[PDB]
From a paper:
At the TGN, the Arf1-5 GTPases are activated by the BIG1/2 proteins in humans and the Arf1/2 GTPases are activated by Sec7 in the model organism Saccharomyces cerevisiae. The TGN-localized Arf-GEFs comprise roughly 1800 functional residues including a central catalytic domain of ~200 residues mediating nucleotide exchange. Conserved domains C-terminal to the GEF domain, termed HDS1-4 (homology downstream of Sec7), act to integrate the signals from several small GTPases, including Arf1 itself, to switch Sec7 from a strongly autoinhibited to a strongly autoactivated form. The N-terminal DCB (dimerization and cyclophilin binding) and HUS (homology upstream of Sec7) domains, though conserved in all Golgi Arf-GEFs and essential for Golgi function, remain more of an enigma.
Here, we present the crystal structure of the regulatory DCB and HUS domains from Thielavia terrestris Sec7 and demonstrate that they form a single continuous structural domain. Following correction of the annotated intron, a construct comprising residues 1–458 of T. terrestris produced crystals diffracting to 2.6 Å. Using experimental phase determination by single-wavelength anomalous diffraction of selenomethionine-substituted protein, the structure of the DCB and HUS domains was determined with four copies in the asymmetric unit. The best resolved chains in the model lack only unresolved loops and the final ~35 conserved residues of the HUS domain absent from the crystallized construct. The DCB and HUS domains together form a single continuous armadillo repeat joined by a conserved ~1400 Å2 hydrophobic interface, comprising helices 7 and 8 from the DCB domain and helices 10 and 11 from the HUS domain. We therefore regard the N-terminal regulatory region of Sec7 as a single DCB/HUS structural domain. In the T. terrestris DCB/HUS domain structure, residues 245–271 of this interdomain region (between helices 8 and 10, including helix 9) are resolved in their packing against the armadillo repeat, and the remaining 46 and 21 residue stretches are unresolved in the structure. The crystallized construct forms a dimer in the crystal via its C-terminal helices 14 and 15, with helix 15 of each copy aligned antiparallel to each other. Dimerization is known to occur in N-terminal constructs of Sec7 and its homologs, and small-angle X-ray scattering (SAXS) analysis confirmed that the observed dimerization mode occurred in solution as well as in the crystal. As such, it appears unlikely that the intact DCB/HUS construct (1–492) is prone to the same artifactual dimerization issues at its C-terminus as is the truncated Sec7(1–458) construct.
Numbering used by the authors:
A (entry chain A): 4 to 38, 42 to 198, 245 to 271, 293 to 326, 331 to 458
B (entry chain D): 7 to 13, 25 to 36, 43 to 82, 96 to 192, 244 to 270, 294 to 324, 331 to 457
Write the structure that this text describes.
Amino acid sequence: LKFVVSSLDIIAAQAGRNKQLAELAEKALAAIKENLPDPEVVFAPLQLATKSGTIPLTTTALDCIGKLISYSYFSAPSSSATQDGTEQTPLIERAIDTICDCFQGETTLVEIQLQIVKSLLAAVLNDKIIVHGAGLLKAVRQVYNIFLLSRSTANQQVAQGTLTQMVGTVFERVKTRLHMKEARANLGRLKALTLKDLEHRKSFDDSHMGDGPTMVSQVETPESLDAEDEAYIRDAYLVFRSFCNLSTKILPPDLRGQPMRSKLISLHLIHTLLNNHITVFTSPLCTIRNTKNNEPTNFLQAIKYYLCLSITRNGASSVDRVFDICCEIFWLMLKYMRSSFKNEIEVFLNEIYLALLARRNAPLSQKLTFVGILKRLCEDP
Amino acid sequence: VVSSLDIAELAEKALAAIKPDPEVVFAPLQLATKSGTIPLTTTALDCIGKLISYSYFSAPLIERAIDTICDCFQGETTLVEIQLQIVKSLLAAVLNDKIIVHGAGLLKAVRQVYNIFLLSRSTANQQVAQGTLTQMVGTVFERVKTRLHMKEARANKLTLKDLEHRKSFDDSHMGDGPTMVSQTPESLDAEDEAYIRDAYLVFRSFCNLSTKILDLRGQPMRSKLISLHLIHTLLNNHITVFTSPLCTIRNTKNNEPTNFLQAIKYYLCLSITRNGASSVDRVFDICCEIFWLMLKYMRSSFKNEIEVFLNEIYLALLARRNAPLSQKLTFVGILKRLCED
């Protein structure tokens, strides 16, 4: 649009002692006058301006970059054999990297931190573009890192909110894809053991799944529907696995510290995703491909190791907030996964919860919370 | 005493012999009981029971007197007054001020009163039988408590079906035991042990009676319920006897001491295994109470079995959607007792 032009006017005006910057800006403004151009000619002064680390070069640049990514201006590398050379230089991973690189720890200016959270949000969660792979997971991790590392309470909060919206969206998109999948299956029919053992029980191989490039979808053949479904589901699995892993750290006797805040946001996000999208987890149509043999595997069976690991490490915590969030996760597992998790449920009941009830010096509130979970299970299915 | 004998040939022969030797008095009394009428049988039983309450019949002579008493019961067609008198005379025989009978003699009396309770048609008779039965077994265990009390002073993978084949203590051909009477460590050991074999035999008998596989007022269910009730009463009222590490019973094979709890383990677990998951709420609730006692006092000794019961019976129940809500809530209440203990 023209926000591109206002951005370049501000950048060229505020360039100051940086001649190269002014020159790239003006070169871009000139190139626009033929009404747009080569993505790189517009992207060069934006990128450079983000590297000054001052206001308003950096904030204006970040704003422009996020909006340009959301308008599908930038694209990802392709492996189509029908490309003729005329295609633009793919720049989306680089645009997202440029945004992410502006956060360099707690000394980064608070206005810039905020602008980074908003630009990643605009890049990742918009109405025209779906980003998959490394770019998405980088945006998500960067918003988390700002939540964890900023010394601004305000920024910690907007980051928490934005992170929640992002992980929520990744799973909502998967839920939509499964809904479509089941509609297609229906249409198709119409026409006619200890606690210590659980840390070493990983049936699903997920080596190098975090790897792989950024892809982009805009908003016909079953092979293609299956591959898209795989993209969506893989985003989901990587997000979920990430939070289980963050939840598994062991702490000694802390609530405003980074370790405890990390454990809490991880457990909270795991619980929220389970509660709001339990059908994504339990559907026998939800399938992700193993890395070793490329054989399709049930989603629940694939995340099982990480879920049980999160509970193994955090159940029986002496911190009541952590104990409570595990109780709720365990409730979901007890209610919607009795069959798939039968043995694990048995271990958690014997070695963590009943063990706690039998313990004489154990906090009474915790005991009552657990027993309350049992009563809730009696009065539901 | 003489009045009883005054109230055909043997009778007067006894009176003549008084001018006394036990057999001459025991002969007409025994014969009189076989009449099956009032007031012959009632008076004879009355007298025999009183004599056993005394030490006239003694340390086998007590067993024959008790046999004669027990033989007066031939089922529900037996006259009600005779039933009641039998219950009272057996009470007087087991619970008196001077004499404690051990072994078969004890075990014969207790089984008989139980049977009267099971077979009588008199609500009154079955109830008084129940009360006396409870008092008998309670008294046996109380006696053991006293003996242990003296003794410390003087000293100073695994499943529900495997539990049916896990018997570490062998009591094959342990038998009822010989009849003995109570009013130098070896004599003391013989005595402490005397009490302990009595207790073990009672408890085993009741677990066994509880072990049958199957309305609510019929004989099988009333048998099951009274066995479970008594088992629970013994655990609840005399737990220290079960938990005491000095309370020891000698194996039948090699006479090597074994802890009492470890000895009754098989039978207690069998009782829970067979009755734990019953669809009938009374049985379910009583088993729950027993399981509670096992949970509170035998966590160390019974860890694996408790784990088996939790996984295969109670949690299983909690997981079933079509399961009765009342049972689930009874179990969860047990767990909550575990919270606020």
